[PDB]
RNA sequence: CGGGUAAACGGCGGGAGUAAUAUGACUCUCUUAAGGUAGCCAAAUGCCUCGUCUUCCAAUUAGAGACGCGCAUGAAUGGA
RNA sequence: GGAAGUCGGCAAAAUAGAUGCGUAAGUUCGCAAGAAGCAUUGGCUCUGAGGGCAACACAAAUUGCCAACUCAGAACUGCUUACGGCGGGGAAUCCAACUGUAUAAUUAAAACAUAGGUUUGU
RNA sequence: AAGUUCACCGAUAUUUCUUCAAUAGAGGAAGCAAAAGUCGUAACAAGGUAGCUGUAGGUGAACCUGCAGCUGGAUCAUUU
RNA sequence: UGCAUGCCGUCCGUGAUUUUUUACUGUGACUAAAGAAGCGUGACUAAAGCAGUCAUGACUUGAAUUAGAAAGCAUGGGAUAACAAAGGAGCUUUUUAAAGGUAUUGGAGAUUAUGGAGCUGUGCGACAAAUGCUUUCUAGGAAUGAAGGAGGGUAGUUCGGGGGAGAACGUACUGGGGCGUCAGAGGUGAAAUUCUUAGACCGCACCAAGACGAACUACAGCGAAGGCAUUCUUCAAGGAUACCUUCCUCAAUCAAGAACCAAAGUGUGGAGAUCGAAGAUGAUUAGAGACCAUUGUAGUCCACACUGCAAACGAUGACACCCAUGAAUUGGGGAUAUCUUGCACGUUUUCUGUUUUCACGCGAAAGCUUUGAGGUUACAGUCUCAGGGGGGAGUACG
RNA sequence: UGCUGUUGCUGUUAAAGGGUUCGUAGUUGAACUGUGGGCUG
């Protein structure tokens, strides 16, 4: 069975702290707790350590960034940007 | 393109007359029960009653006139109305502390007439016929 | 889409008495638009008819004399035993002295006349005069 | 398409009413069945097939020639395919938008078109599996 | 000397008089940097004061709900 | 007899374990909640359930040996209600969101902190 | 025969919960029917700022203003 | 108490072998009175009643008959339909020879061979076969058709302000400096708030930032609706047309349930040029809180998440059939004069879309008219949503 | 009283087509197996 309706993670704190910072909390601490796609292996593999350090479960592989994602919205246009501009200069 | 047709169709055909009769306001009228408790007779054609006092009520535009009228309490369920006494005269037959007979005006509660507001009429008083008494054909008892 | 041939047959021939034409074609055909078109030729509202084959349903063409006023289909196909002859001729034909209502018994489609000669009842399917 | 659209249009091919070969087409009727299964084996479907056959080979309605139609022909000989020949193209076009959608998930009109896909992949199979075609549990993602 | 700034310190009257038994929608005047807005109240903020009405008790300077002529309520000096 | 005492139910009394049933307004949907409330419980003699390892053909679907405690049901029999230990409950107003800190030796709070909001310099 | 003890059927009383129908209340709102005092003129003519719909803010009062829409417009019509 | 006994089609019971209902319609059976219909009858008539009529009694007196929902019972008829099954490659007969492995013998109980019959493996005779073995290269030729219903395929690598992504252009509004000049500029019916010798307005070339995409632009195109207009690259779609390709009823329309949906509005991050709810300041005015002028906050723009309302209108639900004439126009295809050097154009047909000139007819009229608001008292193609005098009121309670 | 409409109502402007689609129960659903013949009046 379901065990709440709509608290989810965020049962652990009760009645404490307000209904909107739990609800705006809640988006990141299940990002955070997911496991993410690693385009080396090809599998779900991902996982956060600390703030910004994301270990991928079967390879040796260690990346940085995004805090509470494995990749930000901003670095993939960064990603594109560059891409294009050294397509140019070469 | 309003009605289905079909052979098969009489379980549709059902409902939507079921549905649509409720629109009816004669029908609904008679099939619920607002109406039976809001009127003061208990769905009856005469009621009796003590009279309260007498009152005059102004006629209604274009005419212009007052209209006798008396306040009664009835008796079944102590229940206050406003009766016209009709015909020349007749307001001296009736006193306070009286007991009448009172009847419906004509139209099933709808007020009648340049009276505004007045859906009853007396028709007997003191176990005596109004209509006797204007005439002279019967005395007033006690 | 097109839920029954007769009806669409019997409004086509009708709306084309009704402009004076001389020649109607029809489409599709079907067993029981050709012998409704028997039975109206047998009692003379309709002249000669072709009907055409293509290896599908076929057409008709089908001679018009002006003798015909109206004809049409009824739907649903009620059940009339032999007592509701009588209902049915005074509720959609003009008078009791000309006209008919065609049926589908166990014997064949026929009028109403030769159906209660016979002592049979069956389902509505149309009527002309 | 009229299942689902505002289309209307009526354009078909129209099947001749003289079902008889014309007469200088020699190729005999067990030639064509050999001629229609080495299409298959090469990866051709039957919609395919019949196509080859009318554009350079010579055969109009292989059925006039051979009594027998393209699938039945392939069923007999084990080369049918295993979902109906409309039923994978349905199917494909779904995976194609889906894989698309993934990196524009704005693009709401081709939302609007994958809905009306969907729906007509469980009507198809839901017929299929009536008549037996499908597997009971077939089951589309 | 000129500009800007109140989630800077702060301020938000001097007031009058008119009008449909009442009353004031209605009008006139005096006057400021501006003239208390949304709310809330005899409140841990009301002098008069044990204010006035309802409820709670046999009986309530106490309690609660209402009202507002608020000595001296009121918006990050944060209001509800 | 039951708060009449007193500024004031201060102090004292009172509730009480376990198991089954049952549980309102309000609400940030997490709670409120042990809400409130009703019922059972001893002793004795029995019964059932819950295990281990040893001996292409499908009732080894059976023979033997053995441990450890819990739960459930029944008959008979008894109370002087009887160690310790162990929440009293309900309806409302004011203040502060909450856990926390804090005048060692008369003040533990409505004070301070807090997450959250805003402004300034660079 | 009176009488003793146990099981079963079970009236009645009290207490607790559930449902249906009626009922008082300081104070606060709405509608109608009047009579006709008070203040203005939103609509109908391009009604003197074209009108109306949805939405948001303001305001003694009809109402005013911003954004998008409609003609039920005051135009069926002018680089052929 | 033998007193006795003799001088081919059917009937009935039981086993083996294999299959058609339901529905509609025609008869028939079985169905309390009273009540309704009605056969007879001069209770003086009638509402009634079932009685009475006529010459040691008769009328072998009378009191007839019918209809009553639906469901249940028997039977006969096969047109319109319903249910169930299937989805087409899970698809020979006969006649003789041989080998192998209950019932009658008097009845009752045991043991026993011989045979019947099926189970099979050998030869032989005769006749069929809906698909040629004297065959093709050794089960693989016997199946309604292909809907001017639906789905799918291939092609012009067709058509279009359809959708998403990324780079880059264009003037203009605003602002800023750089070069000049000097007395006002702005705004209105007329003015004033406002800017200006600390150089406004005006002029030239630029720089920054945010919106927007003029003229071409139309009773034209695309989209389910809301909506959509610079160029180039890119991703997945959509319609029409052409077809002697494939498939074979897979469809139409809807409670429940689901997705999208202008503007305004809400939350969190950006942005902030223009315009501009609230507010401020000038004017009009008896008053003016408005209309007018100068400003100005939220907003207007982007990303993600909500809201689900519009004169969300053609005030006209979806699918299908018939229907008068001439134009015009958008896309594709078929047949046979002009111009540039494959394109455009000319004439005539065709499929799809999109419009304009009181067609018959309809309507209370205004008006509608192949594109219906027509083909309806001569009233029946299919499904579905809503209404029942005006208010109270889309309000109250849940 | 065809002002409850199965027979038999209305829905451009009088009251009334849901903003637009998808979709399940439900309702509705194309053609085909099919002229018996011969002799008398
Ligand atoms: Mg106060
Ligand atoms: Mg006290
Ligand atoms: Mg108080
Ligand atoms: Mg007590
Ligand atoms: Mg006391
Ligand atoms: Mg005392
Ligand atoms: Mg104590
Ligand atoms: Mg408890
Ligand atoms: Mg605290
Ligand atoms: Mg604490
Ligand atoms: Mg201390
Ligand atoms: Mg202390
Ligand atoms: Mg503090
Ligand atoms: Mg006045
Ligand atoms: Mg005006
Ligand atoms: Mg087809
Ligand atoms: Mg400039
Ligand atoms: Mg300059
Ligand atoms: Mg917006
Ligand atoms: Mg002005
Ligand atoms: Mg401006
Ligand atoms: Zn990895």
């Known amino acids: 069975a379901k065990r709440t309706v709509k608290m989810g993670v965020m049962g652990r704190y009760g009645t404490r702290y307000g209904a909107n910072p739990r609800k705006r909390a809640k988006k990141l601490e299940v990002s955070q707790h997911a496991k993410h796609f690693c385009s080396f292996c090809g599998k779900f593999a991902f996982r956060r350590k600390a703030v910004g350090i994301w270990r991928c479960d079967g390879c040796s592989k260690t990346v940085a960034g995004g805090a509470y994602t494995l990749s930000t919205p901003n670095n993939s246009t960064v990603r594109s940007t560059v891409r294009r501009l050294r397509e140019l200069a070469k | ?142 | ?129 | ?141």
Not at chain 2, 104 to 122: E, L, Q, T
Request: charged share 25%.
């Open chain 4, 1 to 141: 398409v009229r299942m689902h659209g505002n289309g209307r249009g009526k354009a078909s091919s129209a099947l001749p009413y003289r079902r008889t070969p014309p007469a200088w087409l020699k190729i005999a009727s067990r030639n064509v069945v050999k001629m229609v299964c080495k299409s298959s084996r090469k990866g051709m479907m039957p919609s395919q097939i019949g196509m080859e056959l009318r554009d350079s080979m010579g055969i109009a309605q292989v059925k006039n020639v051979t009594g027998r139609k393209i699938l039945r022909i392939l069923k007999h000989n084990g080369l049918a395919p295993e979902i109906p020949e409309d039923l994978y193209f349905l199917v494909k076009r779904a995976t194609q938008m889906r894989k698309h959608l993934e990196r524009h998930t704005t693009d709401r009109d081709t939302k609007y078109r994958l809905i009306l896909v969907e729906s007509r992949i469980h009507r198809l199979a839901r017929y299929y599996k009536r008549v037996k075609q499908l597997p009971p549990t077939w089951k589309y993602e």
């Open chain 2, 1 to 142: 393109m309003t009605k289905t047709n079909g052979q098969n169709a009489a379980r549709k055909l059902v409902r939507l007359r079921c549905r649509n009769r409720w629109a009816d306001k004669g029908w609904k009228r008679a099939h619920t029960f607002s109406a039976r408790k809001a009127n003061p007779f208990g769905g009856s054609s005469h009621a009796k009653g003590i009279v309260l006092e007498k009152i005059g009520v102004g006629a209604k535009q274009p005419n212009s006139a007052i209209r006798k009228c008396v306040r009664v309490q009835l008796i079944k369920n102590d229940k206050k109305i406003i009766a016209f006494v009709p015909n020349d005269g007749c307001l001296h037959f009736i006193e306070e502390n009286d007991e009448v007979l009172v009847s419906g005006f004509g139209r099933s509660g709808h007020a009648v007439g340049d009276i505004p507001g007045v859906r009853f009429k007396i028709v007997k008083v003191s176990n005596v016929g109004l209509y006797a008494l204007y005439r002279q054909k019967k005395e007033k008892p006690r």
């Open chain 3, 1 to 129: 889409t097109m839920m029954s041939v007769l009806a669409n047959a019997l409004r086509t021939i009708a709306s084309a008495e009704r402009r004076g034409k001389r020649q109607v074609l029809i489409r599709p055909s079907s067993k029981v638009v050709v012998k409704f078109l028997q039975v109206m030729q047998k009692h003379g509202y309709i002249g000669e008819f072709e009907i055409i084959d293509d290896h599908r349903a076929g057409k008709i063409v089908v001679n018009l004399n002006g003798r015909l006023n109206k004809c049409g289909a009824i739907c649903p196909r009620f059940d009339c035993a032999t007592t509701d002859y009588e209902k049915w001729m005074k509720n959609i034909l003009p008078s009791r002295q000309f006209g008919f209502v065609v049926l589908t018994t166990s014997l064949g489609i026929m009028d109403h006349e030769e159906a209660r000669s016979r002592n049979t009842g069956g389902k509505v399917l149309g009527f002309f005069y």
